[PDB]
Design an enzyme around this catalytic site. Structure first.
Site, mmCIF file in Angstrom:
data_model
loop_
_atom_site.group_PDB
_atom_site.id
_atom_site.type_symbol
_atom_site.label_atom_id
_atom_site.label_comp_id
_atom_site.label_asym_id
_atom_site.label_seq_id
_atom_site.Cartn_x
_atom_site.Cartn_y
_atom_site.Cartn_z
ATOM 1 N N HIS A 156 11.407 -6.215 -32.641
ATOM 2 C CA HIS A 156 11.849 -5.015 -32.315
ATOM 3 C C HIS A 156 12.834 -4.874 -30.982
ATOM 4 O O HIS A 156 13.810 -4.180 -31.107
ATOM 5 C CB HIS A 156 10.462 -4.055 -31.610
ATOM 6 N N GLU A 157 12.651 -5.882 -30.125
ATOM 7 C CA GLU A 157 13.796 -6.185 -29.223
ATOM 8 C C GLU A 157 15.176 -6.571 -30.004
ATOM 9 O O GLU A 157 16.026 -6.303 -29.378
ATOM 10 C CB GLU A 157 13.150 -7.022 -28.401
ATOM 11 N N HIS A 176 17.317 -4.084 -31.072
ATOM 12 C CA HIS A 176 18.096 -3.580 -30.073
ATOM 13 C C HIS A 176 19.220 -4.351 -29.633
ATOM 14 O O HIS A 176 20.356 -3.760 -29.879
ATOM 15 C CB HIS A 176 17.140 -3.413 -28.681
ATOM 16 N N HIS A 208 15.403 3.735 -30.537
ATOM 17 C CA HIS A 208 13.954 4.016 -31.005
ATOM 18 C C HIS A 208 14.069 5.125 -32.264
ATOM 19 O O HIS A 208 14.763 5.835 -32.184
ATOM 20 C CB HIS A 208 13.275 4.568 -29.811
HETATM 21 C C1 LIG Z 1 7.087 -3.451 -31.325
HETATM 22 O O1 LIG Z 1 7.694 -3.611 -30.214
HETATM 23 C C2 LIG Z 1 7.573 -3.171 -28.814
HETATM 24 C C3 LIG Z 1 8.657 -3.801 -28.013
HETATM 25 C C4 LIG Z 1 8.566 -3.282 -26.551
HETATM 26 C C5 LIG Z 1 7.785 -2.273 -26.284
HETATM 27 S S1 LIG Z 1 7.533 -1.632 -24.841
HETATM 28 O O2 LIG Z 1 5.962 -1.088 -24.276
HETATM 29 O O3 LIG Z 1 8.274 -2.430 -23.668
HETATM 30 N N1 LIG Z 1 8.444 -0.092 -24.426
HETATM 31 C C6 LIG Z 1 7.773 1.198 -25.068
HETATM 32 C C7 LIG Z 1 6.891 1.694 -23.806
HETATM 33 C C8 LIG Z 1 7.882 2.366 -22.783
HETATM 34 S S2 LIG Z 1 9.047 1.123 -22.244
HETATM 35 C C9 LIG Z 1 10.613 0.422 -22.885
HETATM 36 C C10 LIG Z 1 11.604 1.620 -23.106
HETATM 37 C C11 LIG Z 1 11.441 -0.533 -22.102
HETATM 38 C C12 LIG Z 1 10.104 0.333 -24.451
HETATM 39 C C13 LIG Z 1 10.678 -0.664 -25.501
HETATM 40 O O4 LIG Z 1 10.798 -0.408 -26.681
HETATM 41 N N2 LIG Z 1 11.522 -1.697 -24.889
HETATM 42 O O5 LIG Z 1 12.725 -1.786 -25.965
HETATM 43 C C14 LIG Z 1 6.638 -1.849 -27.481
HETATM 44 C C15 LIG Z 1 6.510 -2.391 -28.565
HETATM 45 ZN ZN LIG Z 2 12.323 -0.847 -27.472
#
Ligand SMILES: COc1ccc(S(=O)(=O)N2CCCSC(C)(C)[C@H]2C(=O)NO)cc1
Ligand SMILES: [Zn+2]
Ligand SMILES: [Ca+2]
Ligand SMILES: [Ca+2]
Ligand SMILES: [Ca+2]
Ligand SMILES: [Zn+2]
EC number: 3.4.24.17
Length: 169
Positions: free
Chosen positions: A119-120, A123, A129
């Site tokens: 997921h990262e 990005h 998202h």
């Molecule tokens: C499956 O992959 C993921 C990766 C990061 C998050 S997270 O909990 O850090 N996050 C969701 C909750 C709010 S904060 C954020 C905006 C920094 C964001 C996130 O997706 N980082 O890209 C959740 C799931």
């Molecule tokens: Zn994210």
């Protein structure tokens, strides 16, 4: 899915990545696998290929950090923000930072490194998202997904190919 504003995307199919440091939570060997598998996911549905550096500035600089770590968005301790990353671009752009105040695991007994890495790295590749709940790009952190049945969703495949196209052959 949903890309970024002005739709940033690398102007090249081959990207270099570098794991800058290691989390005390897992064996260096598990951190490597997660990153390589987070990379396989996207590499399988696009013309994108990747390679690793152990020195120099790589497109995708990966690292674990706590609180203030070099940018404007300090990490917040345990839970909540798990990790953040930047859109394609020079320097800090494309990089991905992981919060070490989280317990990075190879399973689901805490925060799975693979799942959160895939997921990262989307990005870093240019995807924002997704509203799709079953999508990997959903701000989705759930500890209830077997790892066994994971598969990128059509939504994820749609959005990244919007940027880079399907696999050449
Ligand atoms: C499956 O992959 C993921 C990766 C990061 C998050 S997270 O909990 O850090 N996050 C969701 C909750 C709010 S904060 C954020 C905006 C920094 C964001 C996130 O997706 N980082 O890209 C959740 C799931
Ligand atoms: Zn994210
Ligand atoms: Ca970079
Ligand atoms: Ca946190
Ligand atoms: Ca930790
Ligand atoms: Zn950061």
């Amino acid at each position: 899915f949903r890309t970024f504003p002005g739709i940033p995307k690398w102007r090249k199919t081959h990207l270099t990545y570098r794991i800058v440091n290691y989390t005390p939570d897992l064996p260096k060997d598990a951190v490597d696998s997660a990153v390589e598998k987070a990379l396989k996911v996207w590499e399988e549905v696009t013309p994108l290929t990747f390679s690793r550096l152990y020195e120099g500035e790589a497109d995708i600089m990966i690292s674990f950090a706590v609180r203030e770590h070099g940018d404007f968005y300090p990490f917040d301790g345990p839970g909540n923000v798990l990790a953040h990353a930047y859109a394609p671009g020079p320097g800090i752009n494309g990089d991905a930072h992981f919060d070490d105040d989280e317990q990075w695991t190879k399973d689901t007994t805490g925060t799975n490194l693979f799942l959160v890495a895939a997921h990262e790295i989307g990005h870093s590749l240019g995807l924002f998202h997704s509203a799709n709940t079953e999508a990997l790009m959903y701000p989705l952190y759930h500890s209830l997904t077997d790892l066994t049945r994971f598969r990128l969703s059509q939504d994820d495949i749609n959005g990244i190919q919007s940027l880079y196209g399907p696999p050449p052959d």
